[PDB]
Amino acid sequence: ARSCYRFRTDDDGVVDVAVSGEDGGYAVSVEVPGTRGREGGLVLRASGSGEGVPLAPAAGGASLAAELSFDPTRAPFYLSFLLTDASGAEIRTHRKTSFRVPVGVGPGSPAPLGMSISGDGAVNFAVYSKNANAVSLYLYAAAGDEPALEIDLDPYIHRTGNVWHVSLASVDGYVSYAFCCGGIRRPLLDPYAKVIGDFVSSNSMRCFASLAIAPSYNWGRDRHPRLPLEKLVVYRANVALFTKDRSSGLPDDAAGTFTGLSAKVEHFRSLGVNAILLEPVFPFHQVKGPYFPYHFFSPMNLYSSKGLSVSAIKSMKDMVRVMHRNGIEVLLEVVFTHTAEGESECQTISMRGIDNSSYYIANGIAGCKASILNCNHPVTQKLILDSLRHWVLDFHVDGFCFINAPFLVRGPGGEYLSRPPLLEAITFDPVLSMTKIIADPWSPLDISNVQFPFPHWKRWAEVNTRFSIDVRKFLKREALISDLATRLCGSGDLFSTRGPAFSFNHVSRNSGLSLVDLVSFSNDDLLSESSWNCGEEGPSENSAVLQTRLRQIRNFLFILFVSLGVPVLNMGDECGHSAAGSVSYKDRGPLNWRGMKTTFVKEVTGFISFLTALRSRRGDIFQRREFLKLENIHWYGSDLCEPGWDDPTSNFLCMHINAEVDEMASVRGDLYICFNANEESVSAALPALAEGSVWLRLVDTSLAFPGFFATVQQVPGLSSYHVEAHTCVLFESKSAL
């Protein structure tokens, strides 16, 4: 294959160069046509060479031609030369430079970004850098530490706008590549690489892009579950901590990987979970943790059994296929607001060294030591959208939860944008129009996010942070029952135009206190957590503290699962996982699978399964696309009286729900729900029923397992029931027809 270069000269002319890979040397031919200003021949001097190669006529004086040859074993080099007439005058390029031509590499093409292979086997490299005035390509062999091949890029031939490109006939004998920008000899990682190497802290922070391409994956008959938003039950898990312990039963070096997660699908199936939310799986550094990613196109290599990138790709695809075969959606937490790089050369690995001005916010933000991405800059927009489309199309991912979502509306200067372009681009991307998108206000950074209305276009779901605060305060006898009424009905004050299905409710996440710690630890340093230790701090032997704690755990689960919205469960909250009162997400430990036979875990898992089955069975109430009609909800007090809405001493509320009648087609009963947060028992009255109808009790969290949930006593209408302290009750009306 031959390459051709046409140079305009400084005396209104053209010089034509051709470089041919002769069947192992190289031949360069120079042809100068036209004659207006110079007559008596030309000599090709190699940029000041004392010797010379005269140009001989080719086809009758129309053109002058010369030929040069070069021996093999020469690494890619450049040939530089000048032309001289029979006067001493020198002919240069139209940019006033010596004619420079590459020998051993092709010019390449600016698209696509990254590394690609053509049909003939040529390898194309392309990288964007506006600020760098010099770019070099390094090739490494199987070990490397020093480059086996170094190629400087010509600023004229190997550029199109602000994209540097180059082509190579073959990369045989090489396994990795990197880039060097400016004069700095520090190898950088390709932002668009699909397969990367090992993160090595040299004596520094370097990672190399791999020259191998991922093999074709056979998906088979895989189909997206496409579950409705109003039927979702979400389980949030950490890949490493989910199966790392010995008790999981997985074979070693496969525990704590994607295979370990795939091996436990029956756990989710028995719990009633139909969607799994994974904590971030982008490659990261152990110094800062998973919430500070380096790369956006690969899974972390430590999440695979073999520890390599291609192994991680195949393992992730296998896990996704296994989940889809079981009708379970896969959602991913994604960080796109900041990276793991630093404001110096020692912690530069990628985008910081290629083009700092475009990828990152200048000076960052006050009171922060992280590299804040310039999210709304068009190049970063393109990178983020490319990453999302890649994950959806290549890994068959069903949705995304954007960590630190409020940061995505900040502009280049840090100001708040009234029309943020990246969010709008994500919302109206035609490829992604069927994937779920959820905004999470929580931030791993030291600063805390301020609150403002998030633009949703009736498409974005949100993590409801007010739900946890209000439920925690109610169970602590510190909130008005109006807050509980608002949260039980789907949070209409925030999702009025969207619906209850867009509210993602939770009582505990991977940060803050866990479910067990929420009823066991309350110091003066845990005031931002709304916890109550039920009498004694830490583990206790008192028989009343234990009873109160068990009741409170049952109440928390019950209130979570009977509200309108999507319930989100955190890993370990179904089996008593505890972190000894710490609120750091880094202090959480591996899940213990040994205890899933005892009494407590059995009660918790059975109650969760019962609640999920009840939600499925009565979807006309719990799986709605629109809020319940105001004509079908009645709020009561102690004995069928008016509730005390503004009295901060009545921690008691009753809810009567009337079933609808659908004329499209069957009689479905009513629901009566009572919540008592008082430390004293309260008498409650059941509403009057129809003729020959009775109330059937389904849940009483003060009873004894088994029996406190049952799928049991019948109660006539207008009767009286004694609600114990810290107790929640549920009734369903059954017609004795």
Partner: protein, 710 residues
């Protein structure tokens, strides 16, 4: 298992990206965006069946397997490059909701690289059909064009001289003596003339595919300028000598040949693009590409569903919608990387700053068409990895009342057509009170419009005449437009031309009036060639082309719009003057500057040196600037009706030498060493030059150079 063409070709799921038709894996992948469609079908034509208006083959699209999000896609395995394709869509028909889905229409993919309708310019289809069925070209697995090593010239912008050219009109007249008059190949024969004229950049009038018979049924006029685009990815096939041969490949290759031949001679190419509207018009217009796919996405719509008219042509493209943003950026990148185009000029560019309706409080949780300070499309174009390093020129106004000259959102990257320069120069040169200070500001690159925002003098594109409005010759012949041949009762056209007929109206006048007209044309060219900024002039202004007073000639395929190579030879003096003045600009280092001139280099003068006259009654501007090549030059403009003798700056040890004088008869209006009488002609003015004086006629200009005298 599914087959398409008589059981010979397999049908597979396909991929949603890239949009359009792409050849890979022994087949073609098709992908098209449609949010509102409920069903879709791929239609294939043979070239013979397209003429008969018959679909050769239909492939229904399965909503389960052939749709990812809002993208329909399908793959066909076989040899399809000798066929054409289109789409059929089904959905809701409700013009009062902005929906125009109809199963009997076959629409053209917006990403198609060639559109096959008709082969010959001006000739209708069978039966006098002016809107026959259109279909798109299917690509080849490889490339069939040899660039011969072409590399971008990357000229600095301050070194540019821009020549606006109409592709068909350049060689359509019989006196061009080219093999294929009016085509891309025909224009290649005439690039040496442009090179010898002194231009190094050519701006092409719209070369995207359009219908030149679009309103031929009503009335009988053609659409000659082509500001009504059908497909943005395709060249105008009827500007090619091949036609529809090889399904548009010949036309594409001819355009590439024109570009390669222009680059081989050191000439850059800038393309006119019209992204502000579409040939589909309002609700009464034809359904060709966009209305049949996603009308509410591609067009700006009112509440009831009627079309906003900010372009004054029937509809308005929804430029700042995200899908349209991606489409426009993809189109510009395609032209840059596949046709080697060096830059773009955007027509009615203010429309590209108007807001999209997606940001109304009804949609999320400032209405449609409100101008923005940071429009997302301009942000995407300026900061693109490829498009950020090319030439971007905006005509910064639209027909909806917007006027953004000097305030276009530029990111310190964007250039502008300077219409304030046009107005000020037109008013000063003809003689008008109160324009001397504006003229001096125009000569310096208009720092009052560009310096504060961080832009350079060469971001200003200076021009006196363009394709719209008067030509340079008609600027000095008519006081008013004569547009009655347009058929619109003289309503159309600019009404305030700011022109002077030099004493009499029309081409029949006395000798003194004609002498004054020649002087004034030379003065206009001198003013253009000594200003800071990038000069631009229109095709044929270098020999005095005339349109008969018609200042809006968009609908005439007729010699009034053709380059007259026969009349060019009768006006070799003006052409010689223009060539010499462009050469002079190229030779001086103080004429095209990278920064705004400072007071240490440039000094202003009047009738007496060092005393400029900025009074309201002043019609005289003169300056002198220091030159690293010529030492010092002196320029004076006398726009008064009275002759004057002016004093020259005193430089002991030197004297001034005459170079240019627009009052003198040719060839002494420009002095060159090719003139055998140069020394004698200079010597006959020595009694004036010795005492630092120079006599000037009314409405004349002079340029002098400083040389050592000892």
């Amino acid at each position: 298992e599914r087959y398409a063409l008589g059981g010979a070709c397999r049908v597979l799921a396909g991929m949603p990206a890239p949009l359009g038709a792409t050849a890979l894996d022994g087949g073609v992948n098709f992908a098209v965006y449609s949010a509102g469609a409920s069903a879709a079908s791929l239609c294939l034509f043979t070239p013979d069946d397209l003429e008969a208006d018959e679909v050769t083959e239909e492939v229904p699209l399965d909503p389960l397997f052939n749709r990812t999000g809002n993208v329909w896609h399908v793959f066909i395995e076989g040899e399809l490059h000798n066929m054409l394709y289109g789409y059929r869509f089904d959905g809701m028909f409700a013009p009062h909701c902005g929906q125009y889905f109809d199963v009997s229409n076959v629409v053209v993919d917006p990403y198609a690289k060639a559109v096959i309708s008709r082969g010959e310019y001006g000739v209708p289809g069978p039966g006098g059909d002016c809107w026959p069925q259109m279909a798109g070209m299917i690509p080849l697995p490889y490339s069939t064009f040899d660039w011969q090593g072409d590399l971008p010239l990357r000229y600095p912008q301050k070194d540019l001289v821009i020549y606006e050219m109409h592709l068909r009109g350049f060689t359509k007249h019989s006196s061009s003596n080219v093999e294929h008059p009016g085509t891309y190949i025909g224009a290649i024969s005439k690039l040496d003339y442009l090179k010898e004229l002194g231009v190094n950049c050519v701006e092409l009038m719209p070369c995207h595919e359009f219908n030149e018979l679009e309103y031929f049924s009503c009335s009988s006029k053609m659409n000659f300028w082509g500001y009504s685009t059908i497909n943005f990815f395709s060249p105008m096939i009827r500007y090619s000598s091949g036609g529809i041969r090889n399904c548009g490949r010949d036309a594409i290759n001819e355009f590439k040949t024109f570009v390669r031949e222009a680059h081989k001679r050191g000439i850059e190419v800038i393309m006119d693009v019209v992204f502000n509207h579409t040939a589909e018009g309002n609700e009464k217009g034809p359904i060709l590409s966009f209305r049949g796919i996603d009308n509410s996405t591609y067009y700006m719509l009112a509440p009831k569903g009627e079309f906003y008219n900010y372009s004054g042509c029937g509809n308005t493209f929804n430029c700042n919608h995200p899908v349209v943003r991606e489409f426009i950026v993809d189109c510009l990148r395609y032209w840059v990387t596949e046709m080697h185009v060096d830059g773009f000029r955007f027509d009615l560019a203010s429309i590209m700053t108007r807001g999209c309706s997606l940001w109304d409080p009804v949609n999320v949780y400032t209405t449609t068409g409100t101008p923005l300070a940071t429009p997302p499309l301009i942000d995407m174009i300026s900061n693109d990895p490829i498009l950020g390093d090319v030439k971007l020129i905006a005509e910064a106004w639209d027909a909806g009342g917007l006027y953004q000259v000097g305030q276009f959102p530029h990111w310190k990257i964007w250039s502008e057509w300077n219409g304030k320069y046009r107005d000020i120069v037109r008013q000063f040169i003809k003689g008008t009170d109160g324009f001397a200070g504006g003229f001096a500001e125009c000569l310096c690159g208009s720092p009052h419009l560009y310096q504060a925002g961080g832009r350079k003098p060469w971001h200003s594109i200076n021009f006196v005449c363009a394709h719209d409005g008067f030509t340079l010759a008609d600027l000095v012949t008519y006081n008013k437009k004569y547009n009655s041949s347009n058929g619109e009762d003289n309503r159309d056209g600019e009404n305030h031309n700011l022109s002077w007929n030099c004493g009499e109206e029309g081409e029949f006048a006395g000798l003194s009036v004609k002498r004054l007209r020649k002087r004034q044309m030379r003065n206009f060219f001198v003013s253009l060639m000594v200003s800071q900024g990038v000069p631009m002039f229109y095709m044929g202004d270098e020999y005095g082309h005339t349109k008969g007073g018609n200042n809006n000639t968009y609908c005439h395929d007729h010699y009034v719009n053709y380059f007259r190579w026969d009349k060019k030879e009768e006006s070799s003096d003006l052409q010689r003057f223009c060539s010499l003045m462009t050469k002079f600009r190229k030779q001086c280092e103080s004429l095209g500057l990278a920064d705004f001139p400072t007071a240490q280099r440039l000094h202003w003068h009047g009738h007496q040196p060092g005393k400029p006259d900025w009074s309201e009654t002043s019609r005289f501007v003169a300056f002198s600037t220091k030159d690293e090549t010529k030492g010092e030059i002196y320029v004076a403009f006398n726009a008064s009706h009275l002759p004057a003798v002016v004093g020259l700056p005193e430089r002991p040890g030197y004297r001034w030498e005459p170079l240019v004088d627009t009052g003198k008869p040719a060839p002494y209006d420009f002095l060159t060493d090719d003139l055998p009488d140069r020394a004698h002609a200079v010597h006959l003015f020595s009694h004036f030059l010795n005492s630092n004086l120079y006599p000037m006629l009314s409405y004349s200009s002079i340029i002098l150079e400083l040389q050592p005298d000892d």
